[PDB]
Design a protein around this ligand. Sequence first.
Ligand code: HEM
Ligand code: HEM
Lengths: 394, 394
Amino acid sequence: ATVLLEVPFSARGDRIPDAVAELRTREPIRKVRTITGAEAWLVSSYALCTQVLEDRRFSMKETAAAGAPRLNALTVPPEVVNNMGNIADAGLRKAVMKAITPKAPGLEQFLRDTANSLLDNLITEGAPADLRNDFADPLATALHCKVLGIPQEDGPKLFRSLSIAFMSSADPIPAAKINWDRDIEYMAGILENPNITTGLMGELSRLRKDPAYSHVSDELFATIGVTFFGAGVISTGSFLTTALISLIQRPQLRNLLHEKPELIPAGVEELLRINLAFADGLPRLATADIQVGDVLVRKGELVLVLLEGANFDPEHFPNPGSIELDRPNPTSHLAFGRGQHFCPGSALGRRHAQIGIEALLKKMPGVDLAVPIDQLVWRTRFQRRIPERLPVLW
Amino acid sequence: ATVLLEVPFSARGDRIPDAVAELRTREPIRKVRTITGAEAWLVSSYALCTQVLEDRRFSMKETAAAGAPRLNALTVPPEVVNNMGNIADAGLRKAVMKAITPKAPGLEQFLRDTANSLLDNLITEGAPADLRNDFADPLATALHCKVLGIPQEDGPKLFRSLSIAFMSSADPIPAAKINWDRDIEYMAGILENPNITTGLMGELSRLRKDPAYSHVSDELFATIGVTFFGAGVISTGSFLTTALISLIQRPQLRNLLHEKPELIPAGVEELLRINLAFADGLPRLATADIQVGDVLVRKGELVLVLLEGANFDPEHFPNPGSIELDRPNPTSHLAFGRGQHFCPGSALGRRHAQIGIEALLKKMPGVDLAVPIDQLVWRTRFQRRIPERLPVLW
Ligand code: HEM
Ligand code: HEM
């Protein structure tokens, strides 16, 4: 008597469990138990992961349904799970997506200036430095304040919500609601603030008073701010942190990218491909009986799309664990998802990582871990895998 | 084929593994493998734990011997493992121990004022609060600056060394030496600083220039500062943090202690007894062949004294998992060790916890976790078990 295989497998973000490949080979769709006690189907091949993400009958929205089998507890109101649908329904999708590209004048220069300041401060203070708490996350937080059009000084408090907001918990989290409600009131005030005229919130603030959006709720406008700040900051800060580990562990690659920084975009795409920051499969609920591989998934069942399942699939990415800058299919990974809910911040995510890495390699060409890799403390029961601190020297 | 039982068993500090009692019953001394790959004897009964700690032929000093089986890598120079011997040999033991009692005029008032300020700040900011990073540790750090006689503003930088200095690592940790060397230079400067006239460092500074200590090394004086600050802050901050979890989880006890705070000392003694903050057994190396229970420990072998083994031993503490304020043997636990290396800060440790708890209960009588207990992130490969954050509401 063993128990049903539990997910997630490991909170360690520096290496993929040997188990994933064994599972992909033996049973690329298989039954697992989540932290709530619910059963789910874990999908781990590139082929099946793509099938599920490209079939909307595997629904994101319906994961929020009362009584559904759950990966984890909601940390937002249930309607907010369909945030992107809600945005599209309100006629705001084009405007939202336009505000969060890396293309606004001054944005990239702001990113570089900010990275360089953070780095200069670390160099002035002397090794060891914490690249997560004192570089990657602050860079993410600064970026998103700028992208939203909100004061830099407001970023830290919003950031402080995230260690709870992105928990992956069996049970509802009282602190999540306290912080959610507070952050919503914050964004509501931002929309009322005549001095906020730039970024996403500046644009939302104008659309809010345009007749074509008079019946769009103030709740939805505030929700867009909280949701995009949170997803953006947690996703970019965590990706960059774990990408830095991948790089640091590859001195040859570090030197190549330092010597030839025009390769940094190709480097970042591979670092995205091999990234283990998403802690759990992407959840979807079946709205029909659907054949996936050898399993007939039944209506009402939960499906988890394991991104590293797809991204380390040797059928699609030969020598999957190696960073190779000359692959013929380099953006075909699932780091940003696929299909209806493909990441709307993908360009911005790329640029944050590319600029952060460029700046780091320039300032700290000798960057290395200052502790044995095993000494990193991996955050548990969270929607990302991240080291609590990332101590480096240079 | 299983492997040899590995230690430590769990980094979770909120509950003792069912395994410990099974082990204590079946094999209260048994072979284990440490994180270095070394074999060791894990001792887990009150009787055998006391036997080992009271027999100096199980040596602390000799754990630092080149080529010995190791629990973990040294994070200090090897001579520093015998710090207390070194202090006693230099004629400084009485003076050191006198400076770190809770008895200096103003000290306890300082502790209370500090706790109350920290708490007021949390209340002003609003729930949720992090009781580790924003109460217990800062209280510990403030206390030890005061005890040492050094500026409060110097505490945070010294504190920042500790997440690495008290790692429990398989391998040497480069950052540990960087920080050690820096902190030693700091304490050396303190001894040269004419404005430092109080506390432990004020007293050491005077003894340093007294003829009776002219041939005591400046290295040893600086080492006393780094070592006592580190052990003190990590031990009190971590104990208080985990004691707060124990209390919060016991609303009846929380209310009793709030209503009748004269019971807080008895409460703190039980919280000490059941505390799981020490992450690993206390290491000793056998300097002779010695019978321990059914095992003849051989010269050169490593022995690990599992404090919760002793402290949850139902033979000595009936109903060991229950906090009972009327036990007939309440201080007979091993939270502060036993024998030659009994904690020299035990009184101070008690008072820090008693004052912190009194202040918390007064200010936050409604204190409760703001997240499900399972959502706490337990620090790994560290010499203490502690949650990275302790989110509360009240
Ligand atoms: C390297 C950085 C990033 C990575 C790796 C990443 C990854 C992802 C992934 C895998 C999804 C799909 C989730 C699903 O299908 O269940 C997603 C969606 C999303 N992302 Fe990103 N993301 C990043 C950056 C950003 C940024 C910068 C923002 C906003 C400023 C953002 C906002 C969002 C939002 C709002 C969704 C939900 C899309 C939907 O539900 O339709 N992300 N992201
Ligand atoms: C609740 C607070 C504390 C707890 C639970 C605690 C626990 C312990 C334990 C179990 C030992 C024995 C280690 C061994 O035998 O291997 C010890 C030793 C020691 N403690 Fe504490 N301690 C606390 C507070 C303090 C404070 C406040 C200081 C100093 C200001 C301190 C300084 C030391 C030192 C220097 C040793 C080494 C003793 C030796 O090697 O002879 N501790 N502590």
